[PDB]
Amino acid sequence: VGVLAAQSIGEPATQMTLKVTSGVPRLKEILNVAKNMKTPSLTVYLEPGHAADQEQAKLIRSAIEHTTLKSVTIASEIYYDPDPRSTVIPEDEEIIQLHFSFDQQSPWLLRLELDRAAMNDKDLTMGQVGERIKQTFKNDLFVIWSEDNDEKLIIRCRVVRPAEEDHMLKKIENTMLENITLRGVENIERVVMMKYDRKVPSPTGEYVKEPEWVLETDGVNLSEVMTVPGIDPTRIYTNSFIDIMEVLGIEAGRAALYKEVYNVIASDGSYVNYRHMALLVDVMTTQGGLTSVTRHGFNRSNTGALM
Amino acid sequence: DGPTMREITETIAEAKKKVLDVTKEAQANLLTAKHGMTLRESFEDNVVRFLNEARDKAGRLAEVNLKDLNNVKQMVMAGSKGSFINIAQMSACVGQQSVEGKRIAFGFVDRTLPHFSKDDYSPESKGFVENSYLRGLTPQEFFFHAMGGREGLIDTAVKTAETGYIQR
Amino acid sequence: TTFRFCRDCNNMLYPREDKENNRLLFECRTCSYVEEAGSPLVYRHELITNIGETAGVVQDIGSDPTLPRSDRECPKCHSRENVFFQSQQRRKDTSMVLFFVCLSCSHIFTSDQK
Amino acid sequence: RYRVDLLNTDHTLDPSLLESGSEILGDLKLQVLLDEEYKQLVKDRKFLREVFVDGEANWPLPVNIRRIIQNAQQTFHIDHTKPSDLTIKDIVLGVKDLQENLLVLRGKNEII
Amino acid sequence: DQENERNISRLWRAFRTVKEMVKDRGYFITQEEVELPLEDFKAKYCDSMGRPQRKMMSFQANPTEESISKFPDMGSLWVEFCDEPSVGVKTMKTFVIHIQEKNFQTGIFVYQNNITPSAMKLVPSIPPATIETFNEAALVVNITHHELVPKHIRLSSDEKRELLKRYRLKESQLPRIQRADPVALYLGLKRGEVVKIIRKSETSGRYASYRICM
Amino acid sequence: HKLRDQVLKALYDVLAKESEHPPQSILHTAKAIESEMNKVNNCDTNEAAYKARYRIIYSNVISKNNPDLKHKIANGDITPEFLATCDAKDLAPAPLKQKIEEIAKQNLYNAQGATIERSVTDRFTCGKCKEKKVSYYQLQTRSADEPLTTFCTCEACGNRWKFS
Ligand SMILES: [Mg+2]
Ligand SMILES: [Zn+2]
Ligand SMILES: [Zn+2]
Ligand SMILES: [Zn+2]
CATH class of the missing domain: 2.20.25.10 (N-terminal domain of TfIIb)
Known part of the structure; x- marks a missing residue:
C-alpha cells in the first residue's frame, strides 16, 4: 500500500505547475518542514453573534493588528525651547495652559506630529497613547499632548534631569518610534477582511449560502489571537501547520496537514484517492511529532541500516 | 466567414475603446483606486480583464458560427483532440501574451520595445496579439509570443528535475 | 533644515547651546567661529x-x-x-x-x- | 420520501402496491417496525449532517447499488400493474440480515 | 474600559476551562456550574470595587462514582491560584506541604506569570503525589472545543492489556504522543498510558485509533 | 477640595473670557459649580478619567475653532448631560465632524482587500451542481508537446474540475 500511495502522489506532482506560495515549492515546504513561512497567513472567523457588522469586524481588526509609532507618526522635529513653562512655537500655548492648571528639565523640546486618519482607523484616540508613553516611563519624560479635537496633533515631551542632549534625544526618539507597542499582538501585520459564505443548514432543514465576514492576516501567532474577544475560538485556522501542531496537539496537527496537502494537490490535477494521502500523513505523523522526509528526518529512526 | 470576421474585428475594436477610456480616466487622475490594491494594480487588472473578455467573446462567436461540416469542430466535439481555445486562437484572436501574470514589462526604459514612443499602455504596445494565426503576426507580436513560449519551456525544464527528486 | 558651513573653514556649523543667555549658537568645530541661528528648529525627519x-x-x-x-x-x-x-x-x-x-x-x- | 404511515391518513400507502396491503392497514406490529426504522433513518440523517458539515452527498464508496437494482429491473421484468408480493416484515428483516452478513473484520472479541 | 475588564473576563474564562478540565478528567461537577455567568462570578469574587480575589477562589473536588468504579485509585484533587505575578519559593512550599498534610495526590497549581526554578525544582517531590502547573494564558480558551481536535478518552490498564493481547502488538509499536502535548497536559496523563482517539473519518464516518504517552 | 476649587477657577476664567461677558456672574458661577458637581458625579477625585474628561471639556471650550461653543454653553447646553456625553467627536465643530465621517468611511473602504472576481462563460455544466455558470483560465503546465490545461471553476456552487 505504501508504494502504491507514494507513486499515486508522486506522478501527479510531476504535471503540476511551477501573493501566496503554491505549487511545487509549497509542496516541498509542507512535505519537508522546514518551519519557514513565506505566507504565514491564518484565517480568523468572527463570533457568530456578529454576523455582518462591518464596524465590529473593523473593531476586531483594530484589536488584533500590531501597531507602533511608525504606523502613526507623520512628522518628527526637534526644538530648542528655552522656557520650561512657555513656548517659542506660537501655536503650542493652549496646550501649555491645559497642562498647567517638576521643573528641572532640559530646555530641548522634542515634537511629534500624527495623522488623524491613522489614529482613528484603529480607534486610538491620542489621549491614551499620551498616557501610554507616560506610564511607559513615568520617571524620565514629561509627556504633554493636544486634545483629540484639534486640527493638528502634537506630542510635547522633554527629558527631566537631576550638554550633548541632541544625540540622546535622537536615540530616545528612535526608541520611541521603534519599540512602543500601541495595540494588537505582535507578528501580525496589515489584516484584511473578505466577505465569505458558508452552506449553513437552513432553519427549515435545507442548505443556503449564507454570507459572513472573515478576518484574514499576513502574519502568524496563535497563543493570543485565540484569546481576543469577539472571536470564534473554535474554528480558527492557520496554514502553518507546525504552529497548529504545537498549540493543538498532533491530532489536530495531522488533520491540518492533511487539509494542507489536499489543498496543494487539489489546486490542480485533482484527484487522488483519500486513503493514499491519509497514509502519507499518518506515516509522517506516527512518532508523536512531525517528521520531515529528509536525509535525516525519517532516516534517523531505529530502522534497518541497509535501507 | 466574412461577416463573422467583421464582427470579430469590431468586437476587438470596442474592447480597445474601453481600454482607451480607462487610460484617459487614469491619466486624468480620477479613479476608484480599487481596495486592497495599488492604483497601477487596479489599472492593470481592469485592462487585462477587458482583453481576456474580448478574446473569449470573439472565440465564442467564431465557434457558434462554425459549420457542422467543419472537421476540427467534428474532432473537438468528438472528444479526442483540440479545444475551444485552439479554435479561437487559430481563427479569431491570439490574445494577450503573458510573463508571470503581468504583461510584458518595460525592459527598455519606459517602453517595451524600441519601435514605440515612451510611456504607452495601449495593448498593442505592451503586447496584446490582436491578430490570429490565419493572418499571421506583426513582428512585435511575434516577439511577445516568443516570450510566452520561452517562459513555458524553462518552467518545464526546472519542474521536471525537482519533481523527480521529490518523487524519489 | 539645511546646512550652514563655517565661512572661515568649510565645515558645517554644529548646534551648541548658550549656557546662560539660551541662544542657538551654531559653532564651528574645526575652528572657533560661532554663529547665531535663526529658528529653534534643528533636526527634521x-x-x-x-x-x-x-x-x-x-x-x-x-x-x-x-x-x-x-x-x-x-x-x-x-x-x-x-x-x-x-x-x-x-x-x-x-x-x-x-x-x-x-x-x-x-x-x-x-x-x-x- | 421515506416516512410511511400505516394507521394514520396523510402518509398512507396506496394499497395497490402489495396484494396484502389492504388487510395490513391497521396492524400495530408492522407500524411499530416501520416507526423504529424511520427513527433509525433520522438518526442516520443527523449523524451524516454532523460528519459532512457542508452537506456534500456525492462521495467515494464501495459497491454501487444503482446499477445493481437497475439490472435487477431489466432482468426480472418489473411492470406497472402487478402489486409486488413483497411483505413489510420480509423487507425489514432482510436488510438487517444483510447488514450483519457484511464482514470486514473477522474475530470473536468485543474490540473486534 | 481599561484593563480591569479584560482581567476579569480572562480570569472568568480560565475558571471555566479549569472546571471542565476537572469534569472530563473524571470528577463530578454540576452541569450548571461550568456556565456560571460573569457578573455572578464577579459578585462572588469582588472584594472592594473590581478586584478579584484568587486566593479564596480555589476549590476541592472529588472523583465521580463512575470514575471510581472503573479507576480504583484517585483521591481528591485540589486547585490553586496564587496572586503574586512571580512565584514565591515559600509560597509553593506551603502549598506542597498543605497538599501533603491534607493527603492529596494531584495538585493543580496556576501561576500568573513565570516560576522561578527554585520555586519549581521541588515540584517532582513527594511521590506518589503529583503537582501540575498551568498558565491562565494557556487556560483562557478550552483546547478541546476546537473542532480540529477529536475526542480523547482514557484507557484503564486492564483494557489496555486486553488491547495488546488482541492486536498482538508489544507496547512499542503503537503510535506515540508526547508528554508535553497540549491535549496530554489537558488530560494530565503520564508515562505508559493509552489514549483511544475517536475522530470523524471521511470514508467510514467514525474511526478508532490509539496512542501511547511515551 | 483643591481640585474642586481649581476646576472652579478654570471655569470662572473661561466663562469670564467669553465674548458675552455675562453680567449674571453669580448665575454663571452657579453654572460652573453645578458643572463641577455633575462632573465629580462620575468619580469625585477617585479616578484619573475625571481629569481626562476635564481636559476634554476644558480644551473644547478653549479651542477656537470653535468660539461659538462659549456662547452656546453660556445660553444653554445643560451640563449634567455633558458629564455623560463623552461625545467630543460629535462637537466643536461640525466641519471637523464631517471630516471625521469621511475619514472613517475611507478607512473602512481600505480595510477590505482583494476581490478578484473570476470572469465566466456558460458552456460547460458543473461537475457537482450541474449548472452553467462556468469560469475558466488558460496556461500550459506539462512539456511542450501538448496544449494548455483548460482549467475550470464553477460559480453556482464553487466547484473545480478540468478538461483535457
Ligand atoms: Mg529497522
Ligand atoms: Zn504656454
Ligand atoms: Zn570654522
Ligand atoms: Zn457547480
Missing part, C-alpha cells in the same frame, strides 16, 4: 515623502525623439505643440499623472482633475 514627480526638467527636452507629442495647448502661449511624459519618481504607488511641457513657452503644466 519627514517619515513620509511624496515628492519628485517632475524631475529632471532640462532646458532641451524636445531634442529627444522618443518623447511622444500631443495637441494640448500651453496655457501661457497656447502653442499647439507640446511634450508629455510619465511622472519621474518611480515608486510602486505613484500615479498616472501626465506632465505637459511645451517647446514654445518652455513651460510645464499638468492635467489634474481634482
